[model samples]
Target: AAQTNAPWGLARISSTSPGTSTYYYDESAGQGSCVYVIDTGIEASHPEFEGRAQMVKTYYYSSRDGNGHGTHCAGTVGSRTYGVAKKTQLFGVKVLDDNGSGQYSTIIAGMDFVASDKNNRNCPKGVVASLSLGGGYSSSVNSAAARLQSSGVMVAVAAGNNNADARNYSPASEPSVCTVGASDRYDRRSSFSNYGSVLDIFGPGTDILSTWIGGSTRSISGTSMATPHVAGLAAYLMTLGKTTAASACRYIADTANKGDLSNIPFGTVNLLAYNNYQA
Candidate 1:
């Protein structure tokens, strides 16, 4: 038998079934939990979303899925086949324009918006900020993440696709944040994935299939794709009672699939897998 990958990203960590429309809950699994996909914006009309997206306009550009990146990440974060939590509410905050370009300042403003959104604080499962975008390191950007974390929002960031050290990037190098890198279905690190001691965890971000702009799904690559898996999984953990900002990150790092990756600092980091860690 051949080993399979959990890039679909939901099943390995928590229990979910296809053809079902519900939240998997116990003491820690469900409630007001929601994930805000702060990307290019979502295609609100897309069937994959099924009308659960709360769209916002940051004017970092336009808060619509003009470009497919936001929608794609959204689908992975919470769609039918690719979702981690089927029933969690999703917010689409457009921080990038059609060209998928933006400034750290613009992203900070978006982060500030979510941290201030009064409705989000009540989520029992808590809130999450998933950023697939990154650039040069900035104290201001890192500070925004810290504030959001202090406000009980789990911040997941991409380690960039530059294949260089992640220390040079914002968000990724930001302390107290879950900075992620990219890996393939085989649990192999993506050649383009940036890495370093700063990169907290790695996820499947290669040849990934998810929602696109045309009410359809497509495959894409980059650490951008990898970051959402961690975000979604973090939400699932929240529903299971890992509500604190750092609790989910702690569980993930403490019990990652040590066998999933090769040629990396084993003691420092590992691939994200639901059942990868165990006796």
Candidate 2:
């Protein structure tokens, strides 16, 4: 029988199955820690997330599912069963309303919420933040991202789905942030993914299947989808002992497969090799 992609390659490295004594080891394994998904709200009650999501602090900025993009991205990062980081706790901050767009202030406010959690007695300290959205790179926003990095928080953002060169904006373009591009299972960069020197890593972003609102599943394509794959992987890496964002990123980059730089717009970045790194 052929090996199913259900727990392919990296999935096995951080598998979260129950009753498994082997303890899927990785940099972030056994770190059942907290991460913030800054986007639309997640369907916390979904079976895939049952008993897995931390609901006490999840804030839904939108009323219903809205466009379902945020939920889709959230599923890739922390859905109970299907997500890469199955055991990682999630804090949902709805920056985008139902229309799938929000003001920059809203986005910053969401970031502030996560950053401020350290002061609250209820929340944990040092969370890995996932921002799977971006429009254009801004110096001011990049400064804020740098501040977050200085605070010892791991920040991950999508490189954008413009099918263009370089990152899209704000947090993604921020030098201190981990800007992720999208790739298919075959380890090829997604045509719709943006690329640049600022791009830090690549993940399963093409034609990915993830949880949607209303207790359903669907296939969405975009770097947005790809962004969370890295985010989820980062969470797993943290559990495995790679506590710092820079260390987790360096590990991923060092292990990546040195693909054909000439063919790939992003040059000779080896993502497959990165995903398969042993240490």
In angstroms, the error of model 2 at 10 is 5.9
Q: lDDT by residue for model 2 over 44-143, one digit each (tens)?
A: 7777766555432324433345667777877877775457666677666777776677777667767766777744523232357778887776766677
lDDT of 1 by residue, 243-279 (tens): 4556777677765665556555534376564423121
* Over 4 Å off, model 2: 1-31, 54-64, 118-126, 260-262, 266-268, 272-279
Candidate 1, lDDT over the whole model: 0.73
Give the runs in model 1 whose Cα sits over 4 Å from its true position: 1-31, 118-122, 265-268, 275-279
Show the lowest summed lDDT stretch of 10 residues, model 1: 15-24
Each model's lDDT: 0.73, 0.64
